[PDB]
Amino acid sequence: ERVLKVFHYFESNSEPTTWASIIRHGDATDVRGIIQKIVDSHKVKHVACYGLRLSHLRSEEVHWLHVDMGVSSVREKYELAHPPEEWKYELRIRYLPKGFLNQFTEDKPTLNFFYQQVKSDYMLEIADQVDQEIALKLGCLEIRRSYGEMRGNALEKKSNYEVLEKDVGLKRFFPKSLLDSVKAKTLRKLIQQTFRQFANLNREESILKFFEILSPVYRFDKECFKCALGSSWIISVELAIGPEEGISYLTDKGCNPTHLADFTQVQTIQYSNSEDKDRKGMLQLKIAGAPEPLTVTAPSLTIAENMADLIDGYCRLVNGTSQSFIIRP
Amino acid sequence: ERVLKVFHYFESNSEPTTWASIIRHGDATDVRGIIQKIVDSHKVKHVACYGLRLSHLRSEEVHWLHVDMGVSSVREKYELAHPPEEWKYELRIRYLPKGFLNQFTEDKPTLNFFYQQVKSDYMLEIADQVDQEIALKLGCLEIRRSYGEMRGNALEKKSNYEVLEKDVGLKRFFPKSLLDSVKAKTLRKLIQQTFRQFANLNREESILKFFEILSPVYRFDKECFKCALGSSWIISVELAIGPEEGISYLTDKGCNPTHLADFTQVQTIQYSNSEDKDRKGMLQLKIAGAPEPLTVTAPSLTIAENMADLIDGYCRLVNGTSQSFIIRP
């Protein structure tokens, strides 16, 4: 019996980068058990949406650990390639229900977890590069969510503004790209003016306004994979996997998808090693009412495996099961 | 926190009318929760196909319990009217996908569950009234399925045929209608003669040929309801609801249906009491691309409620949600 530190996105009054839970487990404990123990602690309704992402701290290596995998078997395997201080385990929401935001507002621990997760990704990945009107609104909205006391024109008084700027930092709400490039108090005639259009909202209306604003410049509701379809004339595409498109491919005309299969039609999921000279990842989906299986060639076995995990998650969610649709050969 | 006895169709080597599960539930458990607790044990994939039927033993009263209803609230209501020993709760497959047989072969616990359920209904409802050629093959196919070690030339020998007479029982495979009207040894010239055409079939092929033969004389892939359509000039019809017709009404020509809507078109379901002469149940479906709702007028609220459950089950199955399409005004 050992213990495991899982970073997660359930908020407390500490600093975001320290949010975590230490879970102790046996050699029969699987990843599903780890997940239920952490969220049940927070009275989460939508347990089936959560998964466990293992990232290598010193590269781009990432493994989504399947709910059926044993934690000890997993911890034993990945500690061979790298030392324990080189791995980060985080709980993320990965499998979204159809109409997830509406369904998440009806389960507020998860609505917030998702909000935290999406905001965090937003900062670490696209906050610096985004239209600075957007970066403003999103920032204002998070201030409005934590500090429900700064109503209407209350940030225009200076003795509350400095509670947010000089000591703690504005970098908690705004990208560094924007806090540097504009002047010390041209920034706050912009913030106080921007704040006014959201000053009336409670926190839940703020969380939802956050998503409305962010979605058109950052699709957090899907995952895309560069890969190739076919068993004879292999064509390379960008697959889009998500709640409202099922399995789709991008047709160069934005993230707007062309449909391929519904999760309800996927009967079996299968992923192997590429039988030849390169180390590509293979993926086969048996689709109902379709003679040919859907064959996917991914750049690596790691990526094939991560994709199988995403598709199995939606399959489980869309039927009402805990049983995996993945098989062996 | 109480216990509940749910009859079902997962086979064990006990006696068939005694197959059941005792599930423990609290006062937050919904029907969906009961169903999950029963099926997860058997690695069932298509959980969204299952529903829960409550029948009163001392009348013809039947209530389909909606997955969102809470078990204890339901159970309190019907235990007011009659004591527990007069109620039977059975898990049933009620919502079928298009190409359901094909879909079930890739989830054999359900294929087996469905077979048992359909075979049971057959014996309890129409086995006695069906052409005795049909009764012969159907009875035989269960034998070829039940004893998977016994090959084709094994029933022609007299000393194992009576292993099925004296110990197991012939009433287990054939209607009493047939075991009585033909004599003991004209009947085995009949069983042995019929059995030979199915001797190569394994268990999966036995089940599928069972459905193949049964389907033309007993529709187990649909439900029919006597009711009336329209909001003004009410016409009385027989609705036929199922995977291969969606919502249809019958028009004189057998169970041969006229199409009305596909489940994918159903936007909202709404069912209330008739403010009119009888305690009729009203049922309104908003259909996409039709300005006018489809109004269904049923003989009682109970039938209206049972129809709402069927249509909602299919709406959930066909889209991929747990979210109900039933709205409550």
Among positive and negative, which fits the CA dihedral A178, A180, A186, A187?
positive
Sheet holding B87-93, edge to edge: B20-25, B2-7, B87-93, B50-56, B62-65
Residue numbers in B near A46 (CB within 8 A): none
Nearest residue on chain A to B35, judged by CA atoms? A320
- Does B154 lie in the same domain as B239? no
The helix/strand/coil state of A3 is strand
Quick check: B273 contacting A, CB < 8 Å?
A: no
Nearest residue on chain A to B46, judged by CA atoms? A319
| CATH of residue B64 | 3.10.20.90
- Does A199 lie in the same domain as A176? yes
CB contact under 8 A, A288 and B36: no
Q: How far is B26 from chain A (nearest CA, A)?
A: 16
Among candidate residues A66, A62, A73, the one with its CA nearest the CA of residue A326: A66
Contact yes or no for A201/A144 (Cβ under 8 A): yes
Measured CA to CA, the distance from residue B314 to residue B241 in angstroms comes to 9
Quick check: A289 contacting B, CB < 8 Å?
A: yes
Name which of B36, B99, B102 is nearest A320 (Cβ-Cβ): B36
Residue numbers in B near A32 (CB within 8 A): none
Q: How far apart are the first and last CA of chain A?
A: 33
Measured CA to CA, the distance from residue A177 to residue A182 in angstroms comes to 9
What domain range includes position B264? 220-329
Contact yes or no for B266/B285 (Cβ under 8 A): yes
Disruptive mutation site among A67, A104, A244, A267 for chain B (greatest number of B CBs within 10 Å):
A267
Name which of B32, B43, B317 is nearest A323 (Cβ-Cβ): B43
Amino acid found at A306: N
Query: What does the block give as tokens for B141?
Result: 């196919």
Query: Residues with Cβ < 8 Å from B141, sequence gap 6 or more?
Result: B198, B201, B206, B207, B209, B210, B213
Measured CA to CA, the distance from residue B306 to residue B309 in angstroms comes to 5
Among residues A95, A124, A145, the one where a domain terminates is A95
- Does A131 lie in the same domain as A175? yes
Sheet holding A246-250, edge to edge: A257-261, A246-250, A235-242, A223-229, A294-298, A281-287, A266-273
The helix/strand/coil state of A55 is strand
DSSP string, A174-234: S-HHHHHHS-TTHHHHHHHHHHGGGTT--HHHHHHHHHHHHGGG---S-EEEEEEE-SSS-
Cα-based angle A315, B45, B18 (whole degrees, multiple of 5) = 160
Quote the crossing angle between the two packed helices A132-146 and A186-195, to the nearest 10°. Answer: 60
Give the technique used to solve this structure. X-ray
Query: Residues with Cβ < 8 Å from A225, sequence gap 6 or more?
Result: A238, A239, A241, A298, A303, A307
Among residues B203, B219, B235, the one where a domain terminates is B219
Contact yes or no for B33/B1 (Cβ under 8 A): no
CB contact under 8 A, B321 and A262: no
Q: How far is B35 from chain A (nearest CA, A)?
A: 10
Among candidate residues B288, B270, B283, B273, the one with its CA nearest the CA of residue B325: B270
CB contact under 8 A, B320 and A318: yes
Total of domains in chain B: 3
Measured CA to CA, the distance from residue B55 to residue B91 in angstroms comes to 11
Amino acid found at A91: L
Among residues A95, A125, A154, the one where a domain terminates is A95
| CATH of residue B106 | 1.20.80.10
Quick check: A105 contacting B, CB < 8 Å?
A: no
Measured CA to CA, the distance from residue B110 to residue B45 in angstroms comes to 8
Measured CA to CA, the distance from residue A232 to residue A297 in angstroms comes to 12
Residue numbers in A near B323 (CB within 8 A): 97-99, 103
**Annotated resolution, angstroms:** 2.8
